[PDB]
């Protein structure tokens, strides 16, 4: 369960911000709305 | 300082069991995932399994379903690995590790690993033999025939490290390991200095201090 | 499982230059690849966790990229402390699978080996075994030949050899070749030579001894 500005990374088992992926290469499919 | 000290683990014939402990201290062990990873001698890494904080979701590796069992005790801030019915393919250095993402940054901490040797061969200590000193000279120290690993070698209780080279162990056709430790010293430093190679073998619990001279 | 194909197996490059590794995935794992560093004797050290996102305390020179089935870690400007093994890992699908692992070595000036040969000690003769050792210390690169010739008889199949990793200071290798023989066979031949051929030797250097 992550907010609308975060995706879940199974390696760290924690919600990672989308900003770190939006402004950097192709973000995950779930962050396309936050960019 | 964060730490993940790993105890337990050593030698055991096939089919036997062996429990491992991975004690933590320095970070909230009870709020992160902690996993296991083995590394067979001279090979890559292998994901054994992981476990969540509340122990409500344990993910193993299919090929190792029945062998290993993972559990944790948050009260003692320690992870466990209960290995059952192992084989020679299950020999490796078992590391524990924990990854998380707090404070806005991603971290990762590892234990120092512990060697687990699965084999039916019996423990034997090394048989030390000197190497005859041949404008730079050279002498050594043959550590032949010993099981299991490892074996440590130093010169003069650690008072000689310039040019010392201890080569990795190599398993002979007899299932036993053998390595050499050589050193480069001035040619004229023979009739004036004394050179000793002290070999230790914690498994066999041996200790050989051999003097090398022409 | 998902096979992560990581090439090249070994890469030789000098500090300050560039290094780009590759890791191909058996099947699309999306952006869920990591990158670790492991040095001889220590545990792995993670560097990337989302194919580009870096861990804490990891210099900015480490740059990871790629998605789907092809990922590449780029070490822009190399440093002495950055020469080690590097793995790739996927965690999009269980179980988590690693890569074979590339190893970085420090490309330095060529160095010829200092050959030595140690006849078997009289202590070992009582055991009934014979181990004729031949040392090749201080040479770059690691690609060196070390043959045996018992009375000009080029041996084969009865001589192993291990090697040390790159030295901290001079980043030079050291090789030992052990010819294992029987006590009876050792005392029915007199010459035990060790022919060394390396890039740093115009002609194959050789040194032997008489029993
Ligand atoms: Cu040396
Ligand atoms: Cu013969």
Residue numbers in the entry:
A (entry chain A): 7 to 41
B (entry chain H): 1 to 134, 141 to 220
C (entry chain L): 1 to 211
What does the article say, verbatim?
One of the most attractive targets for both antibody and chimaeric antigen receptor T-cell (CAR-T)-based treatments is the B-cell maturation antigen (BCMA). This cell surface receptor is involved in the survival of long-lived PCs in the bone marrow via interactions with its native soluble ligands APRIL and BAFF. Although a number of monoclonal IgGs have been generated against BCMA, only one has been thoroughly structurally characterized, the chimaeric mouse/human J22.9-xi that showed substantial anti-tumor effects in an MM mouse model. Having shown promise in retarding tumor growth in mice, it was desirable to generate fully humanized J22.9-xi variants for eventual testing in MM patients.
In an attempt to mitigate this loss in affinity and impart greater long-term stability to the variable domains, we modelled additional mutations into the CDRs of both chains that were intended to prevent detrimental post-translational modifications (PTMs). The final constructs incorporating all of the humanizing mutations (except A46L) and the stabilizing CDR PTM substitutions, 44 residue changes in total, are referred to as J22.9-FSY and J22.9-ISY, based on the identity of the hVH M34 substitution (phenylalanine, F, and isoleucine, I, respectively). By SPR, the set of stabilizing CDR substitutions did indeed improve the binding affinity for BCMA, fortuitously by more than tenfold over J22.9-H, putting them in the low nanomolar range. We solved all three structures by molecular replacement: J22.9-H and J22.9-ISY to 3.1 Å and J22.9-FNY to 2.7 Å, thereby allowing comparison of the binding interaction of the fully humanized and optimized IgGs with that of the original chimaeric and biologically active J22.9-xi. The improvement in affinity validated the choices of replacement residues, and the J22.9-ISY structure showed that, despite significant changes in their sequences, the conformations of the optimized CDRs did not substantially differ from those of the unmodified loops. However, the origin(s) of the > tenfold improvement upon introduction of the CDR mutations, given that both the elbow and packing angles as well as their conformations are essentially identical to those in J22.9-H, is less clear. The success of this procedure has been independently validated for the humanized and optimized variant J22.9-ISY that retains its specificity for BCMA-positive tumors and, as an antibody–drug conjugate, exceeds its efficacy in vivo.
